[PDB]
Amino acid sequence: PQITLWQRPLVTIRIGGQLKEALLNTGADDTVLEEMNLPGKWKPKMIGGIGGFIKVRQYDQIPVEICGHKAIGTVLVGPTPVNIIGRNLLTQIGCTLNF
Amino acid sequence: PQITLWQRPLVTIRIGGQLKEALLNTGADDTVLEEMNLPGKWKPKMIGGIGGFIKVRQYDQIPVEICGHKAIGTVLVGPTPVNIIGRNLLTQIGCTLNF
Ligand SMILES: CC(C)(C)NC(=O)[C@@H]1C[C@@H]2CCCC[C@@H]2CN1C[C@@H](O)[C@H](Cc1ccccc1)NC(=O)[C@H](CC(N)=O)NC(=O)c1ccc2ccccc2n1
């Protein structure tokens, strides 16, 4: 589809069997989701942004469905105010910026 | 142009007479540049990111050129790990998300 930027780019995503509201983020390397109890092995990690770093748990090859499209990759989970879908997954659903 | 997301979406911008590199960011509402001197009166503001809140200097109605396209709006200057162009300026140059 085509998404304008007047409003925050919120879309519906399906992960771990649940449907969630995530923000499309060209400015995020990784994908960070609100704390949730996922199955699987996970390594500890530190990621930063404006304001500093926060510790998150890293899960690999997690199947995610973004607005109908299907992708699968790394997902960081932690103390975040919103679900951030980063470039790692955006590339997988053929998403681009145009102006 | 059509920018893919296999690599950080960086672009060259021109502002205050200088050139700086900036990350086109759809997940950001505001535009925050690293600490630099800009003409004009400025007001103290605070913004929150993933790592928390930070203090910034706000400049309104400032002209910015993003890959040749002109935009005029608020620009926040503070201690950020990188220069980011937000939705307030991306909308001005008719930028969208596609896939
Ligand atoms: C600029 C401002 C208006 C304050 N907004 C934002 O920061 C909003 C805030 C939202 C609510 C909280 C959760 C994140 C979302 C999305 N972000 C936008 C979002 O695009 C933000 C922009 C950014 C880019 C580079 C450096 C810092 C910050 N990206 C991020 O926060 C991602 C998070 C991640 N680990 O994937 N960080 C990075 O992509 C990133 C890249 C390089 C870095 C180098 C050193 C230190 C930290 C670095 N972080």
Tokens linked to A84 = 């951030």
Quoted resolution (Å): 2.5
Can you give the CATH number for the domain in which A23 is found? 2.40.70.10
Q: Which residues of A8-42 are buried (b: 16+ CB within 10 A; e: fewer)?
A: ebebebebbeeebebbbbbbbebbbbeeeeeeeee
Quick one: which H or E segment has residue B87? helix B87-90
Distance A21 CA to ligand 1 centre (A): 18
- Entry field: residues in chain B: 99
Instruction: Point out the residue among A50, A91, A94 whose CB comes nearest to the CB of B51.
Output: A50
In this structure, which residue's CA is closest to atom 10 in ligand 1?
Answer: B49
All residues of chain B having their beta carbon less than 8 Å from the beta carbon of residue A31 are none
Rounded CA separation A61/A72 (Å): 5
Asked whether the beta carbons of residue B8 and residue A1 sit closer than 8 angstroms, the reply is: no
Count of domains observed in chain A: 1
Contact B75, B31 (CB under 8 A): yes
Distance of CA B76 to the CA centre of its chain: 8
Bridge partner residues of B64 (DSSP): B71
Distance B46 CA to ligand 1 centre (A): 15
Query: The domain containing residue B50 runs over which residues?
Result: 1-99
What is the per-residue DSSP string for B21-34? EEEE-TT-SS-EEE
Contact B20, A18 (CB under 8 A): no
